[PDB]
From Swiss-Prot, chain A:
Assigned keywords, A-Z: Ribonucleoprotein, Ribosomal protein, RNA-binding, rRNA-binding
Protein name: Large ribosomal subunit protein uL15
Biased composition (Basic residues): 26-35
Gene source species: Thermus thermophilus (strain ATCC 27634 / DSM 579 / HB8)
Cross-referenced SUPFAM superfamilies: Ribosomal proteins L15p and L18e (SSF52080)
Subunit-level organization: Part of the 50S ribosomal subunit.
Biased composition (Basic and acidic residues): 40-49
UniProtKB/Swiss-Prot annotation, chain B:
HAMAP family named among the record's database cross-references: Ribosomal_uL4_B (MF_01328_B)
Species of origin: Thermus thermophilus (strain ATCC 27634 / DSM 579 / HB8)
GO MF, one annotated term: structural constituent of ribosome
Any single GO CC term annotated in Swiss-Prot or TrEMBL for this entry: ribonucleoprotein complex
Name of the protein this chain belongs to: Large ribosomal subunit protein uL4
Function: One of the primary rRNA binding proteins, this protein initially binds near the 5'-end of the 23S rRNA. It is important during the early stages of 50S assembly. It makes multiple contacts with different domains of the 23S rRNA in the assembled 50S subunit and ribosome. Forms part of the polypeptide exit tunnel.
UniProtKB/Swiss-Prot annotation, chain C:
Protein name per UniProt: Large ribosomal subunit protein bL35
Superkingdom, natural source: Bacteria
Source organism per UniProt: Thermus thermophilus
Transmembrane annotation, as ranges: none
Cellular component GO terms held in the UniProt record: cytosolic large ribosomal subunit
Gene expressing this chain: rpmI
Family: Belongs to the bacterial ribosomal protein bL35 family.
GO biological process: translation
InterPro entries, sorted: Ribosomal_bL35, Ribosomal_bL35-like, Ribosomal_bL35_CS, Ribosomal_bL35_sf
Keywords tagged on the record: Ribonucleoprotein, Ribosomal protein
GO molecular function, one term: structural constituent of ribosome
KW Ribosomal protein (keyword) present: yes
Stored Gene3D superfamilies: 4.10.410.60
UniProtKB/Swiss-Prot annotation, chain D:
SUPFAM superfamilies: Translation proteins SH3-like domain
PANTHER family reported in the protein's UniProt record: MITOCHONDRIAL RIBOSOMAL PROTEIN L24
GO cellular component annotations of the record: ribonucleoprotein complex; ribosome
Subunit and interaction comment: Part of the 50S ribosomal subunit.
Keyword Transmembrane helix: no
Pfam family, one: KOW
Record-given protein name: Large ribosomal subunit protein uL24
Protein role: One of two assembly initiator proteins, it binds directly to the 5'-end of the 23S rRNA, where it nucleates assembly of the 50S subunit. One of the proteins that surrounds the polypeptide exit tunnel on the outside of the subunit.
Biological processes annotated in GO: translation
UniProt organism field: Thermus thermophilus (strain ATCC 27634 / DSM 579 / HB8)
Entry-linked CDD domains: KOW_RPL26
Length: 146, 207, 63, 100
RNA sequence: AGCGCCAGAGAGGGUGAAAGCCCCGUAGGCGAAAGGUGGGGGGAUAGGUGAGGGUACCCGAGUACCCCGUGGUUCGUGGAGCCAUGGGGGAAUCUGGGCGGACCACCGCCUAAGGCUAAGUACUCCGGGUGACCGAUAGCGCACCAGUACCGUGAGGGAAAGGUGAAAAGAACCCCGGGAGGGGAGUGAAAUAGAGCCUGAAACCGUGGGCUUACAAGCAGUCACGGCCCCAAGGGGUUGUGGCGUGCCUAUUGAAGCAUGAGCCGGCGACUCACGGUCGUGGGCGAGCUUAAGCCGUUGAGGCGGAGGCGUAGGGAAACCGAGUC
RNA sequence: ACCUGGGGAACUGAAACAUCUCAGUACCCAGAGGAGAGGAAAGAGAAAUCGACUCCCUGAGUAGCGGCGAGCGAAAGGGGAC
């Protein structure tokens, strides 16, 4: 094209400001002029006052962390059929993940809004709704025995 | 969308021509192109700017003066950065400069590359190469009747190392294997010239 | 390097969806305050205005 | 090692500056300085030395070393770069397509 | 400036200034009597090579195991196992013994109390190659006869200092002078290049010249007229009166302030980078977006690589349910 | 320098401080070598599962640990090197 003028297009601005000048931000440097604004402050976020934070609010989050750790339990990834009818044929796990949602997300439970069309759709779980919804014409593939 | 290239006579058969969508003069984007160049010219940056910090220096830690009744200014070790001999404050530390420019862009960039050059008609798909056993002469001779007197810089790319040698030494030429095509060099040179084979792989890289 | 999430905050606050910080009600925590008053009743969850902007920033990774 | 250069105890041609072109015999090779000598710049000193043994000195002095890169070997013609031939036994050098 | 030429060689350095073709080299291609190294490709030893049926002989001891005291692990006494082990007690040999987070029971895993074992990994005294690395107050503490001089009983601390010229041609001889230094002479492109010698800034000390001052009171200047000195319907330099005028910085309610700092000059000298994150913004792509490490090429070519990660549904402590949920 | 073992601090952080933190870091000592260490399951952990060890990328600032403070922080599994 041309080595010359191929540069940024109205916004590189790789021009940070320098607090050491004599006009603009200066002396005190990009604002300051007091103390405890001199080489690091406590937080703020959670900390300070030396008061109580708001570590005052009680941890309701119960049933939380025993010790060996988490409990290996079956997770169920959710997917509406309004994102499902996106295609047709025979929709089942794997067929997803490899596309759309899931990705080893484990159990596939369909459900949702929209209005899926007829096409036996395998899964692990459906909604009292999700079922009836495609009950109009679809599939009841399910569980496992192995 | 304007795409007629310039096939290069093999032997007796004339000069045909090919073509390819936005893969030719379409919507060139100056910025993106640049973006790709920065990235290219940064990643290649051999970052080795070292300077010794305060503790990095080679002095003792003794406290030069008693600190309180000398009139002299208060001081630490001769390593203090206000001590001449001292260590640099925010000197440069050896650091890397690369980052991962979006592939889908890294390519769309090579697109605009080849493109532009072709839209200005400086793109040329060659084929006929009478140059053998790497001989500067033979090559120069070729280019002559090839329509390249050495006025504009020429990025030569071919899977033929022998031709490679041929121009491997001409001041007005940048010889480059086909798999090495890159927006920089493309842009860097005034005229892109490549073997049909080459143009294919570049095409394989995106059809 | 990789800010660590503030456990305690995580242990006591659930951040909804639209970006609201929600936690319990101080006061009733197993009374300890004692003998009722129909107040105990009024203890569900709540929105921490202006202090969540901070609360939130402590869970940058855990989300 | 790697100290070796062109001309040796033989006939050379300057091409320096102040003596640009002035065929002359041997230079008495340096080489730990890369100087020739030849017959070019033959500056005169104040001949006496460290000890005025035997009367004074003189003002007809001698040759000024002269940088080695400024001279060139030569034969039937001018300048001409050295080159090497096998001989089918030993080895010797011969100017570009002329020999000797 | 004019005609050429080589190029698998237009990297670089050097030559009195800016050379592909002058010198050393560069691409490319050859070389080892000798001594190291060397499964990358091959030879040879060492050693290793099956299946059923029976006794009920072996299968690592102060060990396991239990208890007291501790250590390691994300585990801080916890419901606290496992792996280690100082103290006490103290087995069994496959109907054996340990483990899968107290303890049982199921179900399953593994064979403790003997040992060795390449590679992929770490580092940089040492050799080489590169650098949007420094260029003598920098870069190593040392570009130089530096871990020196000097300092300290000692451990230890720890400097400064680089550049004549292309070439010594480095100033014969005469003169002044005890010498040193100079004046001529002479070399050189240049000597205000003459030797701790390129360039040579500032502070600071001088000589000469111009304007100006010995009745006048000042942050030293500014405004205005007038006079003197170098070019002319203008400008410079200076300044005799007149008018007006409390330094700079910092810190403060408030400083000329009799509050802090500064002798003057010249150098060195302070908002950085890495990784997370959050807004904004310039772009790619969009129900999708994107790669890590690593492999392949390159030798200042980029490819490949979907493990993984955001996002597509939220509620609820959880079970769980789901466009709902609590 | 790097490595393994035996010993092993405090300042700091917690806006005091004693648990905790810094940190098994600094340092001291022994030993190993071009590396050292580790290494062929009395393993892992839920998978009809895996199959010495080490190194990198993930997993993951997750699981958890914690005057449940400050703060600390895995492993399996998946990619690679070998």
């Amino acid at each position: 094209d041309l080595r010359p003028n191929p540069g940024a297009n109205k916004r590189r601005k790789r021009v940070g400001r320098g607090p050491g000048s004599g006009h603009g931000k200066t002396a005190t440097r990009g604002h300051k002029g007091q103390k405890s604004r001199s080489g690091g402050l406590k937080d703020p976020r959670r900390f300070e006052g030396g008061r109580s934070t708001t570590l005052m609010r009680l941890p309701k989050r119960g049933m939380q962390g025993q010790v060996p750790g988490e409990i290996k339990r079956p997770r169920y990834q959710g997917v509406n059929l309004k994102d499902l009818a996106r295609f047709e044929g025979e929709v089942t796990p794997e067929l997803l993940v490899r596309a759309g949602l899931l990705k080893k997300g484990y159990r596939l439970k369909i459900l949702g809004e929209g209005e899926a069309k007829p096409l036996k759709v395998v899964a692990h779980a459906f909604s009292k709704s999700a079922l009836e919804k495609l009950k109009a014409a679809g599939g009841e593939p399910v569980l496992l025995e192995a | 969308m304007k795409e007629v290239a310039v096939y290069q006579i093999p032997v007796l058969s004339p000069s045909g021509r090919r073509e390819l969508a936005a893969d030719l003069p379409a919507e060139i984007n100056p910025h993106l192109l640049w973006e790709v160049v920065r990235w290219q010219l940064a990643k290649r940056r051999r970052g080795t700017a070292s300077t010794k910090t305060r503790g990095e220096v080679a002095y003792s830690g003794r406290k030069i003066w008693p600190q309180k009744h000398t009139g002299r200014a208060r001081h630490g070790d001769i390593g203090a950065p206000i001590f001449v001999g001292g260590g640099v404050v925010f000197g440069p530390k050896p650091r890397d400069y690369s980052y991962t420019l979006p592939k889908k862009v890294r390519k769309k960039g090579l697109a605009m590359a080849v493109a532009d050059r072709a839209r200005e008609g400086k793109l040329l798909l060659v084929e006929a190469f009478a140059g053998v056993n790497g001989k500067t002469k033979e090559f120069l001779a070729w280019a002559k009747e090839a329509g390249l007197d050495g006025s504009e810089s020429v990025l030569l790319v071919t899977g033929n190392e022998l031709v490679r040698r041929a121009a491997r030494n001409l001041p007005w030429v940048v010889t480059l294997a086909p798999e090495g095509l890159n927006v920089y060099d493309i842009v860097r040179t005034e005229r892109l010239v490549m073997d049909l084979d080459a143009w294919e792989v570049f095409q394989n890289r995106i059809g | 390097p990789k800010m660590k999430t503030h456990k305690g905050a995580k242990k006591r606050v659930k951040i909804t969806a639209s970006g609201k910080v929600v936690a319990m009600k101080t006061g009733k925590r197993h009374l300890n305050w004692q003998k009722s008053g129909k107040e105990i009743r009024q203890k569900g969850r709540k929105f921490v205005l202006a202090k969540p902007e901070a609360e939130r920033i402590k869970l940058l990774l855990p989300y | 090692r790697v100290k070796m250069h062109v001309k040796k105890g033989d006939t050379v041609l300057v091409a320096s500056g102040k003596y640009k072109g002035r065929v002359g015999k041997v230079k008495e090779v340096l080489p730990k300085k890369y100087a020739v000598i030849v017959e070019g710049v033959n500056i005169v000193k104040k001949a006496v030395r460290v000890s005025p043994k035997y009367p004074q000195g003189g003002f007809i002095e001698k040759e000024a070393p002269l940088h080695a890169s400024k001279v060139r070997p030569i034969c039937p013609a001018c300048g001409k770069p050295t080159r090497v031939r096998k001989k089918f036994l030993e080895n010797g050098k011969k100017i570009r397509v002329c020999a000797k």
